Amino acid sequence: INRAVQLLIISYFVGWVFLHEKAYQVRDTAIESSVVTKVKGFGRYANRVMDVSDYVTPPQGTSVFVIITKMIVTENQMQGFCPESEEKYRCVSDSQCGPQRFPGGGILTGRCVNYTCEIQGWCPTEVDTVEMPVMMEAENFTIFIKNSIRFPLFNFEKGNLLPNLDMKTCRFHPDKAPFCPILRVGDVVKFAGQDFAKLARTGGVLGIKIGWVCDLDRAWDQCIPKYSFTRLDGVSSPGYNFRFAKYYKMENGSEYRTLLKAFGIRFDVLVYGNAGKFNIIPTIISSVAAFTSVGVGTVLCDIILLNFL
Amino acid sequence: INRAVQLLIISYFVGWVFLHEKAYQVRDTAIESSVVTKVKGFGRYANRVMDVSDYVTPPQGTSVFVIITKMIVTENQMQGFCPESEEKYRCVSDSQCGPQRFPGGGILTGRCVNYTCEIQGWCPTEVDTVEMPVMMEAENFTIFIKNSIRFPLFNFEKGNLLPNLDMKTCRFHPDKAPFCPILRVGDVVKFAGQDFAKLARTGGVLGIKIGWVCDLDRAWDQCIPKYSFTRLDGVSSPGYNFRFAKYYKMENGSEYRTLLKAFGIRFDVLVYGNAGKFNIIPTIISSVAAFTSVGVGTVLCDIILLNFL
Amino acid sequence: INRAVQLLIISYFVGWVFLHEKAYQVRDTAIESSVVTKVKGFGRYANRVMDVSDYVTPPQGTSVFVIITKMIVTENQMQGFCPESEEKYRCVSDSQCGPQRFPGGGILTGRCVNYTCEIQGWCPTEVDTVEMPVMMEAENFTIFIKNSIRFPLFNFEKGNLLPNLDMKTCRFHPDKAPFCPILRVGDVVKFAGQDFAKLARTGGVLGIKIGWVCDLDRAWDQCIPKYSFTRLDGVSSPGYNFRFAKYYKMENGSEYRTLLKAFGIRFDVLVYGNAGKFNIIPTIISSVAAFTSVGVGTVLCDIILLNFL
Ligand SMILES: CNC(=O)c1cc(F)c(-c2nc3cc(C)ccn3c2C[C@H]2CN(C(=O)OC)CCO2)c(F)c1
Ligand SMILES: CNC(=O)c1cc(F)c(-c2nc3cc(C)ccn3c2C[C@H]2CN(C(=O)OC)CCO2)c(F)c1
Ligand SMILES: CNC(=O)c1cc(F)c(-c2nc3cc(C)ccn3c2C[C@H]2CN(C(=O)OC)CCO2)c(F)c1
Ligand SMILES: *[C@@H]1O[C@H](CO)[C@@H](O[C@@H]2O[C@H](CO)[C@@H](O)[C@H](O)[C@H]2NC(C)=O)[C@H](O)[C@H]1NC(C)=O
Ligand SMILES: *[C@@H]1O[C@H](CO)[C@@H](O[C@@H]2O[C@H](CO)[C@@H](O)[C@H](O)[C@H]2NC(C)=O)[C@H](O)[C@H]1NC(C)=O
Ligand SMILES: *[C@@H]1O[C@H](CO)[C@@H](O[C@@H]2O[C@H](CO)[C@@H](O)[C@H](O)[C@H]2NC(C)=O)[C@H](O)[C@H]1NC(C)=O
Ligand SMILES: *[C@@H]1O[C@H](CO)[C@@H](O)[C@H](O)[C@H]1NC(C)=O
Ligand SMILES: *[C@@H]1O[C@H](CO)[C@@H](O)[C@H](O)[C@H]1NC(C)=O
Ligand SMILES: *[C@@H]1O[C@H](CO)[C@@H](O)[C@H](O)[C@H]1NC(C)=O
């Protein structure tokens, strides 16, 4: 009975190794998904509350949006020549800056004036590096993410709005309610291992990943999404700043421009999926390989038992 | 001759099962694609026709754009305190709204006035829910979609602009001309199983999918794209509304803001591909599995015939 | 010794064929990536230098941005009826244009006036096709691309900012330094097999592909990205033009609009990945198939040697 027991044990182990790793259930990874993101929540920046229309830069609500948390405004920028207001651009001789100095505000002319050598262009350049406050109440904003995915190979359409496992006081917590699509901005920042104060002050590119890992052999309700968070702006000047320009020409001839530098927390929504469904061909391939492996194991077992090595 | 005929039949069935499901022809699903969308067509909204530059929100023509169909304008919004114009925010006592009421227009102060308790912020809030007309002529807009895909594993570059199977009066109909890239907006809405009037009045997020399913073992001209349409904004307040803010500061000191609420039909272009090419390794694997399966079938056939069970 | 030598040679060839094509090392192609693009560099267009805030259309720095190189401005567009300024719309009789003529500037009315029959809408239409100069200094712009990828199946996070194989004078050249993420716009245009003058004058949609092809069986530092460039706006009127509209209502009642037509070079960043990691199941499958193929080869070899055919 030793040979039968040993071959049964070998076959059982081979089956465990195969079906545990899903040798069958051909896998599809080309998930086609659509994301609709909507921000809700109000906050104050200077002396005035700002609704959703203000801070979020892309109003459509695409896969990628920006939550603006700090604004630096430079108004009435006129064309001309003038020195730069930054420290690092010190000029002691007229030959210091030429076709070797990286421009910071405009095209250089090869001169030197007192405030720094003359960049040409928008004269009142950004006086940056100040103690401007941040939209602290943005720590309490909420993001509603409606994600609709469709695995094409198996024709499997699904969405994250699962009605079983209200939407007015629920948040997203991976422990209590890991299924509500409403993500608190403070919660997203905290779950990424980041302090919110520094992230809002300097800016960063967070990322929300919706892993659609499902086993289609089970029921339709079993396919559930998993939310994860990360930061994708780590080097090893870190930050995320971007500028809008609004132009106007007053009737007295001069051409003006106001420049708004925004430090925000850009959110990226990345959808990844991996769905495995049972298919005849991989099942046959795996069964044949398992049979041959069991045969090889049986051929080796008697030899190793007889030789005790 | 019975055994030879039976083994030939078993081998033929195994070959049918294998080659029908493409046991060989290793498959690649990581399709790298680029989409350029351009809208053409004019329509009237208030008392004036609007060209392409007006209704479409992203002027670049990215993978996702919005066809604005309804506009609600609130001009000269000033900062301050005032009640809200919506019905649902009824206030009979000063304690009704506090740290339990969801803000609708601004940060609450805990008071109660006649128009509703005081939200702080942009005072002339949106008087919404009106009978504003819709851009009905947007039913006749056309969308030109240039899609260029490149399967990287096989180095296979292709595009949907097939010159064989003019581009001035052709539309997209899956029956007559299922190859023209020009998609009528009314046609897209109709093919999604949606009435255009309600969709334009309330807004929605349609989706155009370009399935690049091809068999590279055939000629280059055989690889063709298939267009499909769906809606990806179905819960089970449905809609798709987004707001622009334009700011101006008149010389008499006050800070103003005009808010434009747009109800549009956002179009998402999703590209999915699955290309299978013959490879030596999967062919050998499939042949070995087929040989072993045929052997197993022959081993079972004589037994089942002799035992008649 | 002939049979042993022949079977060893057959086994060696089978192993070469299998391990060379990676029969083992299950492959994942669903790469989840995030791209942050930042443009640096100044240029002059009319009589004034323009910094980053001006030419690039999406200020956020998404996966797709546009480098504007030519601007055509039409100011003070008023609603009304007037003929069109283009040549192709010749009208000799009042019945020439009707429900058969493609509108170019507005909704037609079925009349004929001297400048061309009356389109309704923004009256001072674009007088296009001029000799407007181009932002030639945009040939010296630089693009910083920070790409962070994460293969989910193997949980493999990586980025293109490799610190071993400064970032102030380095460019991207596939021969000298093929690893610096700083891409010169002129270099990108040249590597796509395109002249920069015509591309800037008419517009085009270039594409930068970051192939993340790695072998995870080696060390972590071995996984490196490969940059490639292409053009995805080739038919077989080519170009890429898009228009912004800025509205204002002067106090004397009339409603105005200024239209800015931009000819740019839109850059698309496409991330593709294919990562193979050793797994037990594919290894067993490949070993079984190799054993069976070697057996078949041995069965055929003696026959072909004895029969000499
Ligand atoms: C006459 N009024 C103005 O000039 C003016 C008014 C403003 F409310 C603001 C302002 N500050 C902040 C601060 C935060 C955290 C969020 C939004 N903020 C805003 C509003 C908009 C202004 N944006 C714009 O594109 O405007 C062209 C870009 C996005 O932010 C400004 F920067 C300028
Ligand atoms: C002095 N003139 C204005 O204030 C004004 C003029 C306008 F034509 C309009 C207006 N209505 C509609 C209706 C449809 C269906 C499409 C486009 N529409 C527009 C034009 C733009 C105005 N957009 C903007 O970003 O403007 C900052 C956002 C997109 O729509 C407006 F909302 C305000
Ligand atoms: C009172 N001043 C103006 O009206 C005015 C001022 C300007 F600098 C310009 C202008 N020309 C060029 C040429 C290049 C190559 C790049 C940027 N350029 C610009 C600036 C902006 C204006 N953009 C805008 O959205 O403005 C609403 C869209 C993007 O280009 C303009 F088109 C109009
Ligand atoms: C974000 O919201 C939380 C939850 O309401 C705020 O925390 C509470 O704030 C109230 C304000 O009246 C205090 O009475 C509570 O004691 C706070 N609770 C806790 C646990 O701190 C929080 O202050 C808000 N954040 C910001 C920046 O305003
Ligand atoms: C969209 O275009 C269609 C096709 O031209 C319009 O339908 C025709 O409209 C003309 C207008 O002169 C009528 O004479 C025809 O009888 C209509 N034909 C049909 C089959 O209805 C349609 O009206 C346009 N839609 C909108 C909203 O203007
Ligand atoms: C882009 O930059 C290059 C590199 O600096 C410029 O080419 C040089 O331009 C300087 C200008 O003083 C000349 O002295 C050099 O002789 C040029 N070198 C070469 C090899 O041509 C180039 O002119 C710049 N392009 C534009 C359009 O301004
Ligand atoms: C126009 O007026 C502004 C202030 O409104 C002033 O700074 C500027 O010098 C004037 N420009 C001209 C050309 O008169
Ligand atoms: C400025 O003028 C506007 C109308 O143009 C008026 O409503 C407002 O009260 C005035 N504000 C101040 C601060 O004088
Ligand atoms: C308003 O003034 C503009 C010039 O500023 C002029 O062209 C236009 O005819 C005037 N419109 C009205 C309605 O008075």
Numbering used by the authors:
A (entry chain C), B (entry chain B), C (entry chain A): 21 to 135, 141 to 190, 194 to 264, 270 to 342
From the manuscript:
pmcNeuronal signaling that prompts coughing is well documented and is primarily mediated by ligand-gated ion channels known as P2X3 receptors. These receptors, comprising an extracellular ligand-binding domain and a membrane-spanning ion channel domain, swiftly convert extracellular chemical signals into transmembrane ionic currents, facilitating rapid intercellular signaling and chemosensation. Purinergic P2X3 receptors gated by ATP exist in both homotrimeric (comprising three P2X3 subunits) and heterotrimeric (comprising one P2X2 subunit and two P2X3 subunits, termed P2X2/3) configurations. A single subunit of the P2X3 receptor displayed a distinctive “dolphin-like” shape, akin to the broader P2X receptor family.
Here, we report a cryo-EM structure of camlipixant-bound P2X3, revealing a previously undiscovered selective drug-binding site in the receptor. To resolve the full-length receptor complexed with camlipixant, we employed the peptidisc approach to stabilize the receptor and bind it to camlipixant. Camlipixant binds to the pocket above the ATP-binding site formed by the upper body domain between the adjacent subunits. This drug-binding pocket is encircled by residues that predominantly protrude from the β-strands (β3, β4, β5, β13, and β14). Residues M70, M91, F277, and L293 (subunit A) form a complex network of contacts favoring nonpolar environments, indicating a predominantly hydrophobic binding interface between the receptor and camlipixant. Specifically, R68 (subunit A) and E288 (subunit C) recognize camlipixant by cation–π and charge–charge interactions with the difluorophenyl ring and N04, respectively, acting as a lid in the binding process. Upon camlipixant binding, P2X3 underwent conformational changes, adopting a closed state as indicated by the constriction of the channel gate formed by transmembrane helices at residues I318 and V321. In addition, upon camlipixant binding, the transmembrane helices moved closer to the gate. Camlipixant binding disrupts conformational changes in the upper body domain, including residue Y281, causing insufficient movement of the pore-lining transmembrane helices to simultaneously open the channel. Camlipixant binding induces conformational changes in the extracellular domain machinery that block the ATP-binding site and stabilize the closed ion entry gate.
